[PDB]
Amino acid sequence: VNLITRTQSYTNSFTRGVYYPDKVFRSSVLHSTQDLFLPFFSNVTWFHALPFNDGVYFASTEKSNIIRGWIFGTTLDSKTQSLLIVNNATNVVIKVCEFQFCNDPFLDVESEFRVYSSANNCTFEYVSQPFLMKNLREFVFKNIDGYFKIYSKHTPINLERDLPQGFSALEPLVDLPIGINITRFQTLLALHRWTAGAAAYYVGYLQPRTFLLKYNENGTITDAVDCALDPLSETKCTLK
Amino acid sequence: NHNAQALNTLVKQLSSKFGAISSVLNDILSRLDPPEAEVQIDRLITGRL
Amino acid sequence: SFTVEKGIYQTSNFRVQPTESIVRFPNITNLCPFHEVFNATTFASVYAWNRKRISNCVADYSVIYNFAPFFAFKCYGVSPTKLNDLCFTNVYADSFVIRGNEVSQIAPGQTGNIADYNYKLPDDFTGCVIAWNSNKLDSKPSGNYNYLYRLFRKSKLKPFERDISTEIYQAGNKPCNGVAGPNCYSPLQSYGFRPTYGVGHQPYRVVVLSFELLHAPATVCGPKKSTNLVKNKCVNFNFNGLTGTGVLTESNKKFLPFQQFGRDIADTTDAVRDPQTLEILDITPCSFGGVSVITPGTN
Amino acid sequence: RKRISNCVADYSVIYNFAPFFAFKCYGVSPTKLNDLCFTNVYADSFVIRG
Ligand SMILES: *[C@@H]1O[C@H](CO)[C@@H](O)[C@H](O)[C@H]1NC(C)=O
Ligand SMILES: *[C@@H]1O[C@H](CO)[C@@H](O)[C@H](O)[C@H]1NC(C)=O
Ligand SMILES: *[C@@H]1O[C@H](CO)[C@@H](O)[C@H](O)[C@H]1NC(C)=O
Ligand SMILES: *[C@@H]1O[C@H](CO)[C@@H](O)[C@H](O)[C@H]1NC(C)=O
Ligand SMILES: *[C@@H]1O[C@H](CO)[C@@H](O)[C@H](O)[C@H]1NC(C)=O
Ligand SMILES: *[C@@H]1O[C@H](CO)[C@@H](O)[C@H](O)[C@H]1NC(C)=O
């Protein structure tokens, strides 16, 4: 059932991964925020049981819709709860059930037997309109004090090999009161049934840092400064 | 510049906690009771002074 | 002084009082499941304490008062009197059965076997504790051993930590290997409850309610009905627990579909979103100022 | 009343002696006791009602 090939590379994050810290409107002001962010000009991994650490920035650019769903867990076994997110052509389903996961879980296309043996004891279930709708899709996942937070953004891009240079703020999507530990995560693919395929995506990690954010007259973030990149940035942050 | 900076600092100082539960008087007046709110109110009064 | 010289003197200040009050709340109707967490005829043990989350419902405390004449009712973060008007995001409910003499052992900054080995509260706890006697429900004439309590643990526990481990505590390096006896003892002991037992040993049902403040828009509150909306008048407003006074006018601000409040350079509230009807309203403070008296000499 | 001084102070015997019913420390916390240094220690022992 193993049909996955993963090759690793490294590249530069540039200035991607800026999201609205909270739901407070502001305009024509500069604000200072201390929170988990993706540092400017970072070493991000490119992929053709990854750790979760303290938040994950995920990016993709494939229009084939081959990408769907995510798995989050501690031991990735039926003995412990594990977040499972499935997205299809109609809706998005979120479950916290203790599935007996397999080594290479993927959608059969639509039996989930290869994904997991069977469902088990669980309480939380969520159904909503699907997250997924030349294009770049960016997501940020974090888990703090029993709340699982997800931010997302979709942008139109030109023909490029690496991540583009620019600013695009990420807006909140959902917030779930799960209250469980997450240490590892995995990505789900949908191969037709057993044709071999390949997919690529970018992964980066968050760290606690201080940022200076600029709001325009309509309340949208258009510029950010990392207060620890270099001495000039420290001077800018001190002078506000 | 100096006048504006001084006024801005003075008005910005109003959001400090000074080791209290909250920096809003209405919050304390709506959550707690008379005989205990004094301990919280005293710190705010002092710091603003 | 009884004499005043010619000039202008600054005496007192003036301000404008609000005309009326405005209260707004969502259109929800579902009642909170406070009944189900109580009177369930089944209560968990102290070491394995049940946890429930309550949100997105109308929180009414009448069932609390009519349920039973509670033996113990202690609120720490807020006073028990002003609970029917507050707003909260999520509520955490814990229920269990404890000995009558251990009720006072459950409080922030307190010790005891429950405190250090079973369940402890954080120093910044914000909630209430309710305890009522249950001698006529869970006190068998022969005795009930369903409920157990831990006695031995290596260190102190953590706030809001649940312990479910069932291992024979070892009092040293002497090997025992699953047996009981020398330096190897079971730290769990069963309750003994009989109707002949007096106060101080009979079972007591204990429920801890924990609140959290300022984490998201409020979701569990609203027993008081909303009122109409007025504009261009000095008025009091209470938008989902956000209380203030001033003048509300129409707003042309372009709020994003997920943010509700508004702030300025000085970090003050200058805009709001009406919950029942999605609309943006600007808030301005009511007029105030100083009063000066101009007089010639009293001579 | 007894006075203890000029010796290596180890608190392992305290923990292995008995599962104490009451253990209350005021001046310092009981956790950080294996690293402090003292000049003289005064020990008092007796029997009291529960
Ligand atoms: C990024 O990581 C790779 C391997 O982890 C390393 O070889 C490289 O020097 C790092 N920095 C850059 C700028 O690629
Ligand atoms: C997508 O998944 C949901 C949840 O199982 C299901 O109800 C729906 O029918 C699925 N969509 C399609 C096109 O099968
Ligand atoms: C799930 O958890 C409950 C609660 O402890 C337990 O009784 C049950 O055996 C577990 N497994 C299943 C399959 O329900
Ligand atoms: C979650 O899993 C990790 C790794 O197994 C563990 O260290 C931690 O204690 C668990 N619980 C919480 C609340 O993080
Ligand atoms: C802000 O919005 C106004 C009208 O809504 C528009 O004219 C202006 O260009 C916008 N500013 C931007 C998008 O920076
Ligand atoms: C709760 O349940 C008991 C029995 O299960 C019943 O007698 C009682 O009427 C119920 N309601 C209240 C408020 O106690």
Swiss-Prot record, chain A:
Annotated region described as Putative superantigen, given as residue ranges: 216-237
Positions of glycan attachment: 43, 88, 121, 181, 218
Outcome after substituting residue 68 to I: In strain: A23.1
Domain of life from the UniProt record: Viruses
Cysteine disulfide links: 97-122, 227-237
All copies of domain BetaCoV S1-NTD, residue ranges: 10-239
Function statement: Attaches the virion to the cell membrane by interacting with host receptor, initiating the infection. The major receptor is host ACE2. When S2/S2' has been cleaved, binding to the receptor triggers direct fusion at the cell membrane. When S2/S2' has not been cleaved, binding to the receptor results in internalization of the virus by endocytosis using host TFRC and GRM2 and leading to fusion of the virion membrane with the host endosomal membrane. Alternatively, may use NRP1/NRP2 and integrin as entry receptors.
Record note on quaternary structure: Binds to host ACE2. RBD also interacts with the N-linked glycan on 'Asn-90' of ACE2. Cleavage of S generates a polybasic C-terminal sequence on S1 that binds to host Neuropilin-1 (NRP1) and Neuropilin-2 (NRP2) receptors. Interacts with host integrin alpha-5/beta-1 (ITGA5:ITGB1) and with ACE2 in complex with integrin alpha-5/beta-1 (ITGA5:ITGB1). May interact via cytoplasmic c-terminus with M protein. May interact (via N-terminus) with host bilirubin and biliverdin, thereby preventing antibody binding to the SARS-CoV-2 spike NTD via an allosteric mechanism.
Protein name: Spike protein S1
Gene name, Swiss-Prot/TrEMBL: S
Residues of the full protein shown: 28 to 304 of 1273
From Swiss-Prot, chain D:
Segments for region (Integrin-binding motif): 49-50
Function: Attaches the virion to the cell membrane by interacting with host receptor, initiating the infection. The major receptor is host ACE2. When S2/S2' has been cleaved, binding to the receptor triggers direct fusion at the cell membrane. When S2/S2' has not been cleaved, binding to the receptor results in internalization of the virus by endocytosis using host TFRC and GRM2 and leading to fusion of the virion membrane with the host endosomal membrane. Alternatively, may use NRP1/NRP2 and integrin as entry receptors.
Subunit structure: Binds to host ACE2. RBD also interacts with the N-linked glycan on 'Asn-90' of ACE2. Cleavage of S generates a polybasic C-terminal sequence on S1 that binds to host Neuropilin-1 (NRP1) and Neuropilin-2 (NRP2) receptors. Interacts with host integrin alpha-5/beta-1 (ITGA5:ITGB1) and with ACE2 in complex with integrin alpha-5/beta-1 (ITGA5:ITGB1). May interact via cytoplasmic c-terminus with M protein. May interact (via N-terminus) with host bilirubin and biliverdin, thereby preventing antibody binding to the SARS-CoV-2 spike NTD via an allosteric mechanism.
Protein name, as recorded: Spike protein S1
Species: Severe acute respiratory syndrome coronavirus 2 (2019-nCoV)
